[PDB]
Amino acid sequence: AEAWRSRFRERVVEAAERWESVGESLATALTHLKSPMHAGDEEEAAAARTRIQLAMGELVDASRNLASAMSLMKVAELLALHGGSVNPSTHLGEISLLGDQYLAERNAGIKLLEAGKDARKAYISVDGCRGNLDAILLLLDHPRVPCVDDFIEEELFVAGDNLQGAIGNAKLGTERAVGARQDVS
């Protein structure tokens, strides 16, 4: 009923920082993916590869900070499940079983559980976007393929769609994590 609650707050505070970093990296990645990419000239292909490598660097940052946010939020939940348990040998089965003396942590925990889902969906969508950008890199090395620029256009569209999905998940996840922070601050 004491120390774990501070640790819980610190983890929620740090999770919200990670989430805000994720949103910034995803947004910057998308700025690189707006205009068309072309393979039919070596200079245009090089321009496109550079844009892709910039986007990829932002997506690695986003993925890392998503992985950190998930870990932090999970540890916070477990702090509460163990900390809130009446018997020192056992942990609570789920956050909604927390006693009403820990209402702040219980309210925060409910948000962290859904933020966890938001983070996992964002992570998956980022990996999808990466997959599309990897496909474009393959297509840029086959300029003689008929219709190669149509295939690039297809993959670029899907990359943006996947990334826009992640952006939406991160918006919600960040909102939940800041809500959780507010619950315990």
Domain 3-183, second-level architecture: Up-down Bundle (1.20)
Tokens representing 24 are 């910034």
Domain ranges (residues) in the chain: 3-183
- Tokens 């986007």 sit at which residue? 55
CA distances from 19 to 1, 24, 67, 161, 162 (A): 28, 9, 10, 20, 18
CA atoms of 107 and 104, how far apart (whole Å): 5
- Solved how? X-ray
- Tokens 């933020």 sit at which residue? 115
10 Å Cβ neighbour count for 103?
11
Which residue type sits at 180? A
Resolution (A): 1.8
Task: Identify the burial level of 93 via C-beta atoms within 10 angstroms of its C-beta, where 0-12 means exposed, 13-18 middle and 19 or more buried.
Answer: exposed
Tokens representing 100 are 């009403």
CA distances from 60 to 23, 110, 122 (A): 13, 28, 13
Nearest to 73 by CA among 40, 42, 35, 117: 117
